[PDB]
Design a protein around this ligand. Structure first.
Ligand SMILES: *Cc1c(COP(=O)(O)O)cnc(C)c1O
Ligand SMILES: *Cc1c(COP(=O)(O)O)cnc(C)c1O
Lengths: 452, 453
C-alpha cells in the first residue's frame, strides 16, 4: 500500500476528530506508520521528533515490547469480562492496588472508564450524586474556565471553556458556569504574576457569590491548562482557589488528564501546585496511550458519600477492561520502578526548563516562555515591548506549526501559543536535538513574518 | 492471588459500574480468571456457561489467539498515534475500508470512539450540528424511549429512558424527550402484536406534534431494546417509525451497540427489521469486546451536512486507536470470512430460537418467550392466564438470576425479564447444554416460588 492509496481510503472513509474534513481531504493526511523512543516514521520514510508524545500521552515513549507482551498474555487468558454482574478479574484488582500506592493518601478508590472524556462525565455525575446524598439537591452547578479543556463528551465539552465546542451541540448543558482563565500575559495588566494569581482566583469567589454558594457543587480545573496553550498559573493561584472552595463548601476537582503520571515531575499536577482536590480525573499517561483507559480517583469524603448512597447507576461496558488494565499496570510500574517520574523531577525536567528558556527567550516575536517538568510553551507576539498579540489569534500559530511539521518536528499551536510535551524518557541529547530543529524553524518563522 | 485476597483488594480499591458498593463488598466479588469459547472459569475453578457473551459483546467467543497476535504486532510497531494533527495511520484506514464493505451502501464514513457511550454523545453532537448547517437551529430535540439504553455518558443517559439513571446527575439534559416503549405484553391491551406495532410507532408522531416537528432533530432507538429486557418490537413497528421520521423530516438513528455485528443474523438489527437509518452507533461486538472501540456510521445525507459545516469540534484522544483498530479489523474479518454471521442467519439462530421456545413455553410463571438470531428472552409472571406481572418488577428477576449464577450459568434479569445473548460461535451442542442448565434452574425457581407462597 502506497501513501497515495492510504490517503484516498482515509479521505473516502475516515471522519477525524477536531478537523475540517473537506480541507484535510484536499491537503492529504500524513500517514504515521512506526514509532521508537521519541521518534516517528511516516509513509514517505521521514524520521520525525514527536515533541507532543502522541497527544501529550506517550509518556514512556514508543517501542515498549514488554507492554505488547502484557497485552498479548492478558488477551489470550481473558480478553474481557464485565465489572457489572457482582464480578471482577485479577488485572483490574492488581491495577487498583498499584494505583492506590502512587496516588496521595486518602485516594484509595478508583472508578474506571475508557477515556478522559468519560472520566469527566463520571466526575460530574459523582459530584451531583454526592450532594444529593448530603441532602443538598440544589448544589449542582460546576464551575470551569474559559479556555479549559475537559474532553469532548456532552458533559466534558460543557465544563470546558472552548466556545468553538459550545456552538456545536447547544452547550453548555445546565448547571455549568465559567470564569476567566489565569492568563497573566493578557489579563495581568500592571500586576506581578503573584498579585494576578490572587485576582484571577477571586474571580471564582465572584462567580460563586453571583450564583449563590448553595447552588455550587464543584470547581474543576487542569492544574496547567493543556489544550488551551500550556497556561501556567502563578504560584498564588491554586492555594487561593482552594481557600475559596473550602470557604463556600464547593468540591475541588483537578483534571489530571495531561499533568497526571509524571508530566510536571510530581505524580500529579496538583502536587506541584500544592492543592488537595476531593477527586481528580486521569487518562492519557495512565497507559502512555498504549490502550484506552481512564479513571476517576475519589477521595475519602466523596467516596464515603457515594457508598452511603447505594446504587451508582453509571458505568461503561469496558470499565476495568482487563487488557487495558494489564497495560496500565505495566506502564505505572515502569514509571515508578524505572525512576521515570523521579528522573523528570530531578534531571530531565530542570534540564528541559533551562534549555527551553535558553533557546526561545532571545527571539523578538517570542514571549511568556514558560513550563514545568516536561510541559513547556511560549507565545508568538506582534510586539514584545507592548505585550501585543497578533490579531486573529491562531493564524500566526498555524504558520509556525506548519513550518515545524514540514521540518519533521511535532510541536502544536493553540492559538498563537506553541506547546511541547515530549515523552518523559527523552534524553538530554534528544532535548538538544529537538531544540536545535525548533530554533532553526523559529529563525525561518521570523524571516517569513518580515518577508510579508 | 487467593480468592480471599482478590476480594479484599477489590473491596478496598475498585468502584464498579451500576453496583451498590457496600452490598458488593459485604457479598464478595466473583473473580473471573479465564475464558475459552462460550466458557469462563472463576478463581474457585468453577466452569461457567457465559449465556451473556461478556456483556452481549464477545461475539466470536473467548480464546482468539490470532486477535492477541494482531494486538501484539500493532502495539510493537505503533501503539498510538492521534488522528487530530492532519494525521492518520494504516490500522484505522484499513479498518474504515473493511467496515465500508460490511455496512449497507451509503455508509462510507465512520467516526471512531472508545465506547458505545461516546458513540451516542458523538451522534447527539452530529445530529445537532447537521441541523445548524441546514439553517434550522431550533431542530435540536432527540426523542428516545422509556426503558431505552443509550449508554452512560450525560448525553447517552439523557437519551436513554432509565429513570434510575436520570435521578443521578439531574438528567435528562435539554432537547431530550421520551415516548413509551413497544412492550406488547404490558401495553398491547386488546390488540395483536402487529396492530400494537402501528399504535406504538404512532406515539412518536403524537410526541413530534406535541413538541412541534420544527423542534425535533432525531428519533433514536435500539432495534431490540437490550438492557431494557430484549423487548422485540412487532414487525409493523420499525417501518411505521421510519414513515413518521420521513414525514416530519426527522433523522432516524439506530443504536446498534448490541444488535451490531451479527447478533440478529443480519450484520445490523435495522437490516432484520427493514428500516434505513441516517446514522447508527456501534461498539461491543465491533471488537467482540477484545479492546474498547466504538463508531458512528454516518450515511451520505448527514456526512454531506457535517462536511459542508467545516470544523467538527468533537473527538477523543484515542479515536481510531491503532491497536484497537487492528483488533476490530481481525474481528470483522473473522465474522465475515469465517461465515460466523451467515451461520447465525442460516443455522444457529433458527436452532436457538426453536430450542428457546421448546424449553421455556411449558413453565406456569414464564410468558412472552421471544428472540431473534442469538438474542432471546422471556418474562417471569405472577399469573400467566391473566398476563399479570409481579409487583416490584425486578425482585423475582433477582431471585431467578441468582439461581442461574449459583448453577454456573450467566443469564441476566432486567426487572423480571430473563435475557440471553451468548457468543455467535456457540455450537448446537453448547445451545442444548445451556438450555438444559437453564431449564433445571427454572424448575428450581418455580418450586421455590410455590414453597415461599
Ligand atoms: C485529553 C483531555 C481530556 C479528554 O480525554 P479523551 O481520552 O480524549 O476522551 C480531558 N481533560 C483534559 C485536561 C485533557 O487534556
Ligand atoms: C452497551 C450499550 C451502549 C454503551 O456502551 P459503552 O461501550 O458501555 O459505553 C450504548 N447503547 C446500547 C444500545 C448499548 O447496549
Amino acid at each position: 500500500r502506497t501513501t497515495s492509496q492510504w490517503r484516498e481510503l482515509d479521505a473516502a472513509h475516515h471522519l477525524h476528530p477536531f478537523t475540517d474534513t473537506a480541507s484535510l481531504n484536499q491537503a492529504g493526511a500524513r500517514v504515521m506508520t512506526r514509532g521508537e523512543g521519541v521518534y516517528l516514521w511516516d509513509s514517505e520514510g521521514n524520521k520525525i521528533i514527536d515533541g507532543m508524545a502522541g497527544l501529550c500521552c506517550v509518556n514512556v515513549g514508543y517501542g515498549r515490547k514488554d507492554f505488547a507482551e502484557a497485552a498479548r498474555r492478558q488477551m489470550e487468558e481473558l480478553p474481557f469480562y464485565n465489572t457489572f454482574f457482582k464480578t471482577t478479574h485479577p488485572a483490574v484488582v492488581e491495577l487498583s492496588s498499584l494505583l492506590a500506592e502512587v496516588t496521595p493518601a486518602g485516594f484509595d478508590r478508583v472508578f474506571y472508564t475508557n477515556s478522559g472524556s468519560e472520566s469527566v462525565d463520571t466526575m460530574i455525575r459523582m459530584v451531583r450524586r454526592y450532594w444529593d446524598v448530603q441532602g443538598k439537591p440544589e448544589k449542582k452547578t460546576l464551575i470551569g474556565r474559559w479556555n479549559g479543556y475537559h474532553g469532548s463528551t456532552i458533559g466534558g465539552a460543557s465544563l470546558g471553556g472552548m466556545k468553538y465546542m459550545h456552538e456545536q451541540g447547544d452547550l453548555p448543558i445546565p448547571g455549568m458556569a465559567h470564569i476567566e482563565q489565569p492568563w497573566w500575559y493578557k489579563h495581568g495588566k500592571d500586576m506581578t504574576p503573584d498579585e494576578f494569581g490572587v485576582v484571577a482566583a477571586r474571580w471564582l469567589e465572584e462567580k460563586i457569590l453571583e450564583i449563590g454558594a448553595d447552588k455550587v457543587a464543584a470547581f474543576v480545573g487542569e492544574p496547567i491548562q493543556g489544550a488551551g496553550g500550556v497556561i501556567v498559573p502563578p504560584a498564588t493561584y491554586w492555594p487561593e482557589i482552594e481557600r475559596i472552595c473550602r470557604k463556600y463548601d464547593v468540591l475541588l476537582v483537578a483534571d489530571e488528564v495531561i499533568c497526571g503520571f509524571g508530566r510536571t515531575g510530581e505524580w500529579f499536577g496538583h502536587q506541584h501546585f500544592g492543592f488537595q482536590p476531593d477527586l481528580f480525573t486521569a487518562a492519557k499517561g495512565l497507559s502512555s496511550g498504549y490502550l484506552p483507559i481512564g479513571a476517576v480517583f475519589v477521595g475519602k469524603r466523596v467516596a464515603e458519600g457515594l457508598i452511603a448512597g447505594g446504587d451508582f447507576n453509571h458505568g461503561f461496558t469496558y470499565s476495568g477492561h482487563p487488557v487495558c488494565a494489564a497495560v496500565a499496570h505495566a506502564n505505572v510500574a515502569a514509571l515508578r520502578d524505572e525512576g521515570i517520574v523521579q528522573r523528570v523531577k530531578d534531571d530531565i525536567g530542570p534540564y528541559m526548563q533551562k534549555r527551553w528558556r535558553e533557546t526561545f527567550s532571545r527571539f523578538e516575536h517570542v514571549d511568556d516562555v514558560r513550563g514545568v517538568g516536561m510541559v513547556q510553551a511560549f507565545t508568538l507576539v506582534k510586539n514584545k515591548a507592548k505585550r501585543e498579540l497578533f490579531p486573529d489569534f491562531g493564524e500566526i500559530g498555524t504558520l509556525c506549526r506548519d513550518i515545524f511539521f514540514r521540518n519533521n518536528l511535532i510541536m502544536r499551536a493553540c492559538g498563537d501559543h506553541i506547546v511541547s510535551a515530549p515523552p518523559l524518557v527523552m534524553t538530554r541529547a534528544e532535548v538538544d536535538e529537538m531544540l536545535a530543529v525548533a530554533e532553526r524553524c523559529l529563525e525561518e518563522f521570523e524571516q517569513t513574518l518580515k518577508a510579508r
